[PDB]
């Protein structure tokens, strides 16, 4: 409906403004499946549509861009999402990925382990997460806000996302976190984006566009997730792979966005406005250094 030719559908603003109660997610198209181009994996199609949507936002795209991708491994031991991200991002972008389980990747560096073990000296311009535990899909128990890797993600954003940077964090009906929604009010703009190839699922990507480092809006995350589910429950999305067949404008434009190092007292309203427009990144421009904490144990005799 125009929508079928888009990469997906973003949560309309009026739904964000409601005060709904959380209900069960019952999708009309549950069990439908889009018809993927021959030989193309779901995860390639899904990340392609995600990136096609991010192309429509005011992402900061500096030289020497730094992107980190959590949850990047597959049961097949490869990283399809990382491969799409590297295709999308400007050549030379520094791309780090990670997963609990071993996998081989096109990223510049890969860390294997629980995300909680991941540390980085530097700040990042874009954080992508597909971390997910299918055990959360338990319709027999109450659907409360989840902690686990979401607690890590919230802290990682607040500590290591550059001002001006953006995030896309995968959620579902049961895999979500109230503080992560609250943190969306710390970006100049935010949404929940559903890919058209996977519209039969309660999955979405929670996107925070241009990080401001402080609340612009106070969001109640329990209410916002209820709002998200209400939207999904009342707005069936037609499964579609149409956008996959036109890749001519896929690459992220290298905007050469300015990078400055500034201290808290220096972030005035003119800076805040530049940040909000995708025109500035604030972080150190030092070398990128990462590590994974390793627990040591000796269980001999």
């Amino acid at each position: 409906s125009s929508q079928a030719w888009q990469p997906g559908v973003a949560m309309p603003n009026l739904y964000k403004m409601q005060r709904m109660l959380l209900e069960k997610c019952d999708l009309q198209n549950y069990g439908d499946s889009a018809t993927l181009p021959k030989g193309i994996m779901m995860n390639v199609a899904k990340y392609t549509q995600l990136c096609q949507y991010l192309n429509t936002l005011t992402l900061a795209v500096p030289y020497n861009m730094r992107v980190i991708h959590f949850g990047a491994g597959s049961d097949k031991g490869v990283a399809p999402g990382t491969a799409v991200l590297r295709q999308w991002l400007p050549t030379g972008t520094l791309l780090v990925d990670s997963d609990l389980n071993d996998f081989v990747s096109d990223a510049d560096s890969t860390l294997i382990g629980d995300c909680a073990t991941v540390h980085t000296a530097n700040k990042w311009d874009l954080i992508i997460s597909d971390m997910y535990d299918p055990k959360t899909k338990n319709v027999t128990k109450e659907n409360d806000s989840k902690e686990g890797f979401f607690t890590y993600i919230c802290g990682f954003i607040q500590q290591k996302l550059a001002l001006g940077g953006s995030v896309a964090i995968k959620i579902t009906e049961h895999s979500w976190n109230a503080d992560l929604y609250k943190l969306m009010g710390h970006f100049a703009w935010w949404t929940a984006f559903v890919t058209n190839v996977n519209a039969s699922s309660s999955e979405a990507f929670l996107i925070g566009c241009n990080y401001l480092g402080k609340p612009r809006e106070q969001i109640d995350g329990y209410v916002m997730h209820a709002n998200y589910i209400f939207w999904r429950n009342t707005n069936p999305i037609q499964l579609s792979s149409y956008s996959l067949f036109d890749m001519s404008k896929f690459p992220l434009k290298l905007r050469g966005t300015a990078v400055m190092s500034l201290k808290e007292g220096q972030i005035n309203d003119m800076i805040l406005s530049l940040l909000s427009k995708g025109r500035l990144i604030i972080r150190e421009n030092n070398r990128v250094v990462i590590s994974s904490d390793v627990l040591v144990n000796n269980e001999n005799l």
Binding site: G77, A83, V104, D106
Partner: protein, 114 residues
């Protein structure tokens, strides 16, 4: 002593073994240069583009790379595979060689000997 993984896969394939799967095929225009190994997908009409790591025998089998450096020619790049051979990208990359002047696969694009 050193395992010869390349020969093993070649013999496994000749024995009738099923080719390595789950190579990561990319969406692209299929209007690219057609060169063999590129920083971004460059398949032409006759090719598919794949994420390089997933097509590297050494990456995929968790074995040292056949290079004193151990550098991976494919990881972090994209490999173009003729569509007729895209059922076995790992085999193709092993059994074939890239023209060092024009960047095409010898016998699947390289017109240098003309």
């Amino acid at each position: 002593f050193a395992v010869d993984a390349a020969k093993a896969y070649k013999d496994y394939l000749a024995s009738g073994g099923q080719p390595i799967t789950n190579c990561v095929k990319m969406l692209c225009t299929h209007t690219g240069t057609g060169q063999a190994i590129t920083v971004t997908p460059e398949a032409n009409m006759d090719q598919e583009s794949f994420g390089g790591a997933s097509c590297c025998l050494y990456c995929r089998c968790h074995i040292d790379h056949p290079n004193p450096k151990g550098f991976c020619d494919l990881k972090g790049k994209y490999v173009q595979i003729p569509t007729t051979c895209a059922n076995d990208p790992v085999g193709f990359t092993l059994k074939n060689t890239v023209c060092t002047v024009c960047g095409m696969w010898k016998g699947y694009g390289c017109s240098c000997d003309q």
